[PDB]
Amino acid sequence: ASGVAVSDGVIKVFNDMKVREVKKRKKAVLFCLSEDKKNIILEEGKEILVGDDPYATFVKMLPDKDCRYALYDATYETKESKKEDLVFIFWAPESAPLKSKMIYASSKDAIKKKLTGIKHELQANCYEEVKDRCTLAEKLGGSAVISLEGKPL
């Protein structure tokens, strides 16, 4: 545990995203450490509205040399039913510096445990692991999922 404090705006954003106007609902959002590295703040201009490939424009939003937290409201349609559950994404590229990787990894449980009710966590340590649409489907429902983001898998 690093000891950083998760900002209160993160909990409210998750609370609004967890429950289900539509044009203002968030589909994706990014979290980062503050400049002093003592708070898990919300990135001002890194988010996706529901009204606005939603997954493609989210992956390209991830930095290439720094770690980030993310909350994606992935939608998928299994054979039996169609459901939408939030996915917590811990983006930690290998090219990121050693200090950034350690502080983000040691403080990941500080933010994840504050967002109670989350059921899916994707740990992406490279671009091939986050661009991969198959692994996200497996995390959601495994073999049950047939289509993701409205497109066949």
Partner: protein, 359 residues
């Protein structure tokens, strides 16, 4: 400034928080005559004394010798007074709770450290790789550990301990170097063989093909210069010594190799998480620094694992001191100043405060 001490099975790595590398790395031995010499003094004191490891397989068995090593660490190696600096200590996986409290008591009562903290070595290596879920194959001096960690929580039912590590490889290299006519028997000559192991040994991707290559040419032969100027040559022993990691039968041991121990611990977990463990196998420790060990581990685990699964072996370039580097980064954070266990907190809840504050 805070102190980070990595109590290894054979080497003690100590330093200051915020530094890139530990300042002092000395053997974790206490030598007594055949009065008491600790660390490199016991090595550089002839074969006139018996050597003993207080930590031999990750777990402290002799707490009287451990205090001698810690006293040597702060005063002779770090050259600081422990009563003025907080100390961050690392503990082996599956460390008994009684040992955890005894470590806390010694720091606050024998050394009077103002603040103190305990971290798991395996989770520090995994965090340093930017991961929270995965399996860490920590191969050190006296013990090899495979620790599957899921969402920051190590799975105790699946942690496997392997007694094969660098210490057994150094003794094996001594045994097979006498086949060429090189007599390495004394304690001083043991350190020379360790230098040969750390400079000329490598893991062969295909052991049987490599042995034929060595016997049919001399491209694999390398020269090493002894401290007194003599030059010795080493051939197939370069890849035979680290091959005992994957074939413990070379040492006469019953246990499985590091690749099979990793596979056995993965298969001891839930099926839902085995896919994530297979793709997040992180290597750490000195014994994992052989060139070509990640390629060999990737190939061997792929054979055991199902064909549909994806196998990824992570070998960061800083994995030799990944436990210490993670602790130094953590202890130097401005937010970590509230995570320490104070002296005032210790003499209000006792040694049991370590279970609440840490862990």
């Amino acid at each position: 400034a805070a102190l980070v001490v990595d109590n290894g099975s054979g080497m003690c790595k100590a330093g200051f928080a915020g530094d890139d590398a530990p300042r002092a790395v000395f053997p974790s031995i206490v030598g007594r005559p055949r009065d008491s010499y600790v660390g490199d003094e016991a090595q550089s004191k002839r074969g006139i004394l018996t050597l003993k490891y207080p930590i031999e397989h990750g777990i402290v068995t002799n707490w009287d010798d451990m205090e001698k090593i810690w006293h040597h660490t702060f005063y002779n190696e770090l050259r600081v007074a422990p009563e003025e600096h907080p100390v961050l200590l690392t503990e082996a996986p599956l460390n008994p709770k009684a040992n955890r409290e005894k470590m806390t008591q010694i720091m606050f009562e024998t050394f009077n450290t103002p603040a103190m903290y305990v971290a798991i070595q395996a989770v520090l290596s995994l965090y340093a790789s930017g991961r929270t879920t995965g399996i860490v194959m920590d191969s050190g001096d006296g013990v090899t550990h495979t620790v599957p960690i899921y969402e920051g929580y190590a799975l105790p039912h699946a942690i496997l301990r392997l007694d094969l590590a660098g210490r057994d490889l150094t003794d094996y290299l001594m045994k097979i170097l006498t086949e060429r006519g090189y007599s390495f028997t004394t304690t001083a000559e043991r350190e020379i063989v360790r230098d040969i192991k750390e400079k000329l040994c490598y893991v062969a991707l295909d052991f049987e093909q490599e042995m034929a290559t060595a016997a049919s040419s001399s491209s694999l032969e390398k020269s090493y210069e002894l401290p007194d100027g003599q030059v010795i040559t080493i051939g197939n022993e370069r890849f035979r010594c680290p091959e005992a990691l994957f074939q413990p039968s070379f040492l006469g041991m019953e246990s499985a190799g590091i690749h099979e121990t990793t596979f056995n611990s993965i298969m001891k977990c839930d099926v839902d998480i085995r896919k994530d463990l297979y793709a997040n196998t992180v290597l750490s420790g000195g014994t994992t620094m052989y060139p070509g060990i990640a390629d060999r581990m990737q190939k061997e685990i792929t054979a055991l694992a199902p064909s549909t699964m994806k196998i990824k072996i992570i070998a960061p370039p800083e994995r030799k001191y990944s436990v210490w580097i993670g602790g130094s980064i953590l202890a130097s954070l401005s937010t970590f100043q509230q995570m320490w266990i104070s002296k005032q907190e210790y003499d209000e809840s006792g040694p049991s405060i370590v279970h609440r504050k840490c862990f």
